[PDB]
Amino acid sequence: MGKLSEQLKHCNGILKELLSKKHAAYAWPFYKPVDASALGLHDYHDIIKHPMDLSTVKRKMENRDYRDAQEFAADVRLMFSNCYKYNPPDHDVVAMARKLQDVFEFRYAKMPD
Ligand SMILES: CNC(=O)c1cc(C(=O)N[C@H]2[C@@H]3COC[C@@H]32)cc2c1O[C@H](CF)[C@H]2c1ccccc1
């Protein structure tokens, strides 16, 4: 029950919230890796070097891959950054990213010290 454990429990709580029915209307594009081929996005992997999605964050959390809150937050923000890099700012998925990042940032800010 040390500080790192406690901070990663807060991260795990946020992760569960981002995956919850409450946010499903705007979270769903981030549930699984972007299927570039299926979506016809044949330039996706040329523009996005480091893909990230919530299923990958969940696997890394379950595998105890994250050693601290900062490492977890870096993956969640990489996921949003990839969305803002690849997509025109007027696309629905960017509006959805902004809304889910608002949920993330406000709760991440309530990290226990
Ligand atoms: C992280 N997800 C994505 O970046 C993403 C990109 C595109 C896309 O087609 N992006 C291309 C825009 C126009 O050309 C470059 C960018 C489409 C969708 C995406 O997530 C959903 C699939 F999970 C799918 C979606 C469908 C309808 C509404 C919202 C989201």
Short mmCIF file of C-alpha atoms and ligand atoms in Angstrom, two decimals:
data_model
loop_
_atom_site.label_atom_id
_atom_site.label_comp_id
_atom_site.label_asym_id
_atom_site.label_seq_id
_atom_site.Cartn_x
_atom_site.Cartn_y
_atom_site.Cartn_z
CA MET A 1 0.00 0.00 0.00
CA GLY A 2 2.95 2.36 -0.82
CA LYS A 3 2.65 5.70 -2.75
CA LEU A 4 3.42 4.11 -6.22
CA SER A 5 0.85 1.28 -5.58
CA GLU A 6 -1.72 3.91 -4.37
CA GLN A 7 -1.09 6.18 -7.42
CA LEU A 8 -1.41 3.16 -9.82
CA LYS A 9 -4.73 2.20 -8.06
CA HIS A 10 -5.95 5.77 -8.91
CA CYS A 11 -4.72 5.20 -12.52
CA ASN A 12 -6.57 1.82 -12.61
CA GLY A 13 -9.75 3.60 -11.33
CA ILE A 14 -9.45 6.18 -14.17
CA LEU A 15 -8.86 3.33 -16.72
CA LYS A 16 -12.04 1.51 -15.49
CA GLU A 17 -13.98 4.84 -15.80
CA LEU A 18 -12.69 5.48 -19.39
CA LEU A 19 -13.88 1.90 -20.32
CA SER A 20 -17.28 2.29 -18.46
CA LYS A 21 -20.77 2.63 -20.08
CA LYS A 22 -20.87 6.27 -18.72
CA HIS A 23 -18.37 7.41 -21.46
CA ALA A 24 -19.08 4.75 -24.19
CA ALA A 25 -20.68 7.34 -26.61
CA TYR A 26 -17.23 9.05 -27.15
CA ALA A 27 -14.76 6.42 -25.72
CA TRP A 28 -15.54 3.57 -28.19
CA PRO A 29 -13.01 4.60 -30.94
CA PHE A 30 -10.24 4.15 -28.27
CA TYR A 31 -11.34 0.67 -26.98
CA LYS A 32 -9.14 -1.35 -29.42
CA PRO A 33 -6.10 -0.69 -31.67
CA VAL A 34 -6.96 1.35 -34.84
CA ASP A 35 -7.62 -1.30 -37.56
CA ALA A 36 -5.96 0.83 -40.32
CA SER A 37 -6.56 -1.82 -43.08
CA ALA A 38 -10.27 -2.32 -42.09
CA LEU A 39 -10.85 1.52 -42.00
CA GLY A 40 -8.94 2.06 -45.33
CA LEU A 41 -6.35 4.24 -43.47
CA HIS A 42 -3.32 2.95 -45.49
CA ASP A 43 -1.09 5.89 -44.31
CA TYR A 44 -1.95 5.44 -40.56
CA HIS A 45 1.23 3.44 -39.63
CA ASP A 46 3.45 5.84 -41.70
CA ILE A 47 2.11 8.86 -39.68
CA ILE A 48 1.61 7.10 -36.27
CA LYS A 49 4.93 5.45 -35.17
CA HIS A 50 3.60 4.34 -31.71
CA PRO A 51 -0.09 3.24 -31.79
CA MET A 52 -1.86 3.17 -28.39
CA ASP A 53 -5.44 2.34 -27.25
CA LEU A 54 -7.25 1.54 -23.96
CA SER A 55 -7.12 -2.31 -24.48
CA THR A 56 -3.28 -2.00 -24.68
CA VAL A 57 -3.24 0.28 -21.55
CA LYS A 58 -5.45 -2.34 -19.77
CA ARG A 59 -3.12 -5.26 -20.78
CA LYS A 60 -0.05 -3.26 -19.55
CA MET A 61 -1.85 -2.43 -16.22
CA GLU A 62 -2.90 -6.14 -15.75
CA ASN A 63 0.73 -7.26 -16.56
CA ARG A 64 2.11 -4.71 -13.97
CA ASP A 65 4.04 -3.10 -16.91
CA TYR A 66 3.50 0.49 -15.53
CA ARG A 67 5.97 1.26 -12.69
CA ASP A 68 4.36 4.69 -11.86
CA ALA A 69 1.38 7.00 -12.66
CA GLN A 70 3.56 9.10 -15.08
CA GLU A 71 4.22 6.02 -17.33
CA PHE A 72 0.45 5.18 -17.42
CA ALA A 73 -0.48 8.85 -18.19
CA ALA A 74 2.16 8.95 -21.02
CA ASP A 75 0.35 6.03 -22.80
CA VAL A 76 -3.16 7.58 -22.35
CA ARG A 77 -1.85 10.94 -23.70
CA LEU A 78 0.04 9.17 -26.58
CA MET A 79 -3.35 7.62 -27.58
CA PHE A 80 -4.98 11.13 -27.71
CA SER A 81 -1.88 12.70 -29.41
CA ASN A 82 -2.05 10.00 -32.18
CA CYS A 83 -5.74 10.96 -32.74
CA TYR A 84 -4.88 14.74 -32.95
CA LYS A 85 -1.87 14.03 -35.28
CA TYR A 86 -3.68 11.73 -37.79
CA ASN A 87 -7.25 13.18 -37.94
CA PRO A 88 -8.47 16.55 -39.30
CA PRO A 89 -9.52 18.67 -36.27
CA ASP A 90 -13.17 18.78 -37.63
CA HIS A 91 -13.57 14.91 -37.68
CA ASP A 92 -16.06 13.46 -35.09
CA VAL A 93 -13.26 11.23 -33.59
CA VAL A 94 -11.27 14.40 -32.57
CA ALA A 95 -14.37 15.84 -30.76
CA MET A 96 -14.68 12.39 -29.03
CA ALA A 97 -10.91 12.38 -28.11
CA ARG A 98 -11.20 15.94 -26.60
CA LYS A 99 -14.23 14.84 -24.46
CA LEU A 100 -12.52 11.62 -23.21
CA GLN A 101 -9.23 13.52 -22.55
CA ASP A 102 -11.24 16.08 -20.46
CA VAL A 103 -12.55 13.11 -18.34
CA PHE A 104 -8.96 11.76 -18.07
CA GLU A 105 -7.16 15.08 -17.26
CA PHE A 106 -9.65 16.27 -14.57
CA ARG A 107 -9.57 12.90 -12.72
CA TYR A 108 -5.76 12.41 -13.22
CA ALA A 109 -5.33 15.87 -11.54
CA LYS A 110 -7.04 14.39 -8.38
CA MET A 111 -4.04 11.95 -7.96
CA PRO A 112 -3.40 11.18 -4.24
CA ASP A 113 -0.05 12.69 -3.03
C1 LIG B 1 -8.60 6.41 -32.73
N1 LIG B 1 -9.52 6.31 -33.86
C2 LIG B 1 -9.29 6.94 -35.01
O1 LIG B 1 -8.31 7.66 -35.17
C3 LIG B 1 -10.33 6.80 -36.09
C4 LIG B 1 -10.05 7.36 -37.34
C5 LIG B 1 -10.99 7.31 -38.38
C6 LIG B 1 -10.74 7.87 -39.73
O2 LIG B 1 -11.36 7.46 -40.71
N2 LIG B 1 -9.85 8.87 -39.83
C7 LIG B 1 -9.53 9.49 -41.10
C8 LIG B 1 -10.01 10.89 -41.34
C9 LIG B 1 -10.09 11.40 -42.77
O3 LIG B 1 -8.87 10.98 -43.39
C10 LIG B 1 -7.85 11.00 -42.39
C11 LIG B 1 -8.55 10.62 -41.09
C12 LIG B 1 -12.22 6.68 -38.16
C13 LIG B 1 -12.50 6.12 -36.93
C14 LIG B 1 -11.58 6.19 -35.89
O4 LIG B 1 -12.01 5.59 -34.74
C15 LIG B 1 -13.22 4.83 -35.11
C16 LIG B 1 -12.85 3.38 -35.25
F1 LIG B 1 -12.60 2.83 -34.00
C17 LIG B 1 -13.76 5.44 -36.43
C18 LIG B 1 -14.88 6.45 -36.23
C19 LIG B 1 -16.00 6.46 -37.05
C20 LIG B 1 -17.01 7.39 -36.86
C21 LIG B 1 -16.90 8.34 -35.87
C22 LIG B 1 -15.79 8.35 -35.05
C23 LIG B 1 -14.78 7.42 -35.23
#
